[PDB]
Design an enzyme around this catalytic site. Structure first.
Site, PDB file in Angstrom:
ATOM      1  N   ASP A  35      -6.260 -87.464 -40.818  1.00  0.00           N
ATOM      2  CA  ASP A  35      -5.929 -87.297 -39.406  1.00  0.00           C
ATOM      3  C   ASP A  35      -6.145 -88.590 -38.652  1.00  0.00           C
ATOM      4  OD1 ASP A  35      -5.508 -86.472 -36.846  1.00  0.00           O
ATOM      5  OD2 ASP A  35      -7.295 -85.186 -36.691  1.00  0.00           O
ATOM      6  N   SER A 199       6.498 -97.073 -27.716  1.00  0.00           N
ATOM      7  CA  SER A 199       7.855 -97.061 -28.214  1.00  0.00           C
ATOM      8  C   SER A 199       8.801 -97.643 -27.165  1.00  0.00           C
ATOM      9  CB  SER A 199       8.269 -95.637 -28.586  1.00  0.00           C
ATOM     10  OG  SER A 199       9.657 -95.570 -28.882  1.00  0.00           O
TER      11      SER A 199
END
EC number: 3.4.23.22
Length: 330
Positions: A35, A199
């Site tokens: 994770d 992004s």
């Protein structure tokens, strides 16, 4: 040193991925959820409340000759999905894919919430975010990667998650045969303890690319892709019959639909998520309404590049002095 381990989807929907991990002496192998959105290595154990264990493999520290109780240390964590767990702490030997850390904090669960009990395939979590998020008190502990880093050939790990298929976590090296083209690296902020990056934009299907900054985290422990409501609305508008359902808790779509791809930007590069990766199947058994793999982050407070996005790429988690993230197509 290096390590390399295969990671396997837990079910037919790729709801999560498990990777075998050797703990203790002799080894006790548990299948953990790696994770990158959290920083605790915790396991179902011989100390876990009996009624809260249902099929999981447990760590039994008393059977490990290298296990040592970390005096006074406790842990307690709550995840974005509402699940939680807590317990005490041992140090022990932990190996992943041939890479060994001695003195790793292994957080033994005394209590887990129902969602963990109900998932027989996940024996615990192995956190790979920054150690600043580790919940051990009163002395915070380091992640497996943080402990291994200095010994690694290169201070990196890579995630290569499969779509309906096994994949690989590598530590300490970049497998140059595992991706196509080049790896595009992008800046990371560690200010919130995550692999947080920006992004450069998105496209829906064959649509034109929208240049827009989307700050979010690379999180292997989250199944879906959570993005701003405007982006998600633009995606689902391209799917006939798709709608946001308050009762179901997100966008649903007719199971008979063919989904468009979703592209996200990494600098000037582009990662294309095929439409099929966005299908999470019937909302309930036998339903013809299907749950979408792209959902709104509104009310999460952060965008999350979860498995839906990451499995479309070869992802480098670069733990150099200034961390960065790398993405390649594959």
């Amino acid at each position: 040193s290096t390590g390399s381990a295969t990671t396997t989807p837990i079910d037919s929907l790729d709801d999560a991925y498990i990777t075998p991990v050797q703990i203790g002496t002799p080894a006790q192998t548990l299948n953990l959820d790696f994770d990158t959105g959290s920083s605790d290595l915790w396991v179902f154990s011989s100390e876990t409340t009996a009624s809260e264990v249902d099929g999981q493999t447990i760590y039994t520290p008393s059977k490990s000759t290298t296990a040592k109780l970390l005096s006074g240390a406790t842990w307690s964590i709550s995840y974005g999905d509402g699940s939680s767990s807590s317990g005490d702490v041992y140090t022990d030997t932990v190996s992943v894919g041939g890479l060994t850390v001695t003195g790793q904090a292994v957080e033994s669960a005394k209590k887990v919430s129902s969602s963990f009990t109900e998932d027989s395939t996940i024996d615990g979590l192995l956190g790979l975010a920054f150690s600043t998020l580790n919940t051990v008190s009163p002395t915070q502990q380091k992640t497996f990667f943080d402990n291994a880093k200095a010994s690694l050939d290169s201070p990196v790990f890579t995630a290569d998650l499969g779509y309906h298929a096994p994949g690989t976590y590598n530590f300490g090296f970049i497998d140059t045969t595992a991706y196509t083209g080049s790896i595009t690296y992008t800046a990371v902020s560690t200010k919130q303890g995550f692999w947080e990056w920006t992004s450069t934009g998105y496209a829906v299907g064959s649509g034109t690319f929208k240049s827009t900054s989307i700050d979010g985290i690379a999180d292997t422990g989250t199944t879906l892709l959570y993005l701003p409501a405007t982006v998600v609305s633009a995606y689902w508008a391209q799917v006939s019959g798709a709608k946001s359902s308050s009762s179901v808790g997100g966008y649903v779509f007719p199971c008979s639909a063919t989904l468009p791809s979703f592209t996200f930007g990494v600098g000037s590069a582009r990662i294309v998520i095929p439409g099929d990766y966005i299908d999470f199947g019937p909302i309930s058994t036998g339903s013809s309404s299907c749950f979408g793999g792209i959902q709104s982050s509104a009310g999460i407070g952060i965008n999350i590049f979860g498995d839906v996005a990451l499995k479309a790429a070869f992802v480098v988690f670069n733990g150099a002095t200034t961390p960065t993230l790398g993405f390649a197509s594959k």
